[PDB]
Amino acid sequence: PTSHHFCFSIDLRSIHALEIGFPINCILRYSYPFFGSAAPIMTNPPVEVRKNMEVFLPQSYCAFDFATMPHQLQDTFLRIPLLVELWHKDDLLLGIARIQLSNILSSEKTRFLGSNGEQCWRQTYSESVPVIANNRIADLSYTVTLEDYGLVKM
Numbered sequence: 396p397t398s399h400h401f402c403f404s405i406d407l408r409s410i411h412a413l414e415i416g417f418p419i420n421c422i423l424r425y426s427y428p429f430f431g432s433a434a435p436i437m438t439n440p441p442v443e444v445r446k447n448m449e450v451f452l453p454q455s456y457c458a459f460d461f462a463t464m465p466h467q468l469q470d471t472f473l474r475i476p477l478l479v480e481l482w483h484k485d486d487l488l489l490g491i492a493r494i495q496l497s498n499i500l501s502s503e504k505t506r507f508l509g510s511n512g513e514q515c516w517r518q519t520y521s522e523s524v525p526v527i528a529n530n531r532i533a534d535l536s537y538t539v540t541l542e543d544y545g546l547v548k549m
Contacts, residue, residue, distance in 0.1 A: 406539075414530060427475075429463075439454045473500075476493040478494075490533065494537065499520040499541050516545075518540070
């Protein structure tokens, strides 16, 4: 009776490599089971990334439709960072970026037409965060969006 219908999306738009020692065939990979248990979601195909160049990742957008109580979503986003692993495929795990999904909850929440054709309250947030080996080997630019469709329909 108090659960809401939400749609969340993440777009790992680009990676600007800095101090990875060598050119890599790159894929970014992540899981966030609070939206539903699943094998890791990955960008695809692997793309070449070389020192000091910004590369846009293919298949980098995913949306997630789920129902939960607003406090559960707020607590999970506050407590559990989304960890995005940067892998070199051939495979080596080069680094991880820790994204604090609660940053979007501090964004202005306004009434929008939602992606499903129904009204919603919408928030969005974009930033760049470092991908940590130990050292900072790359920067990941991303955007997240949260649609709140209100109480689950009867």
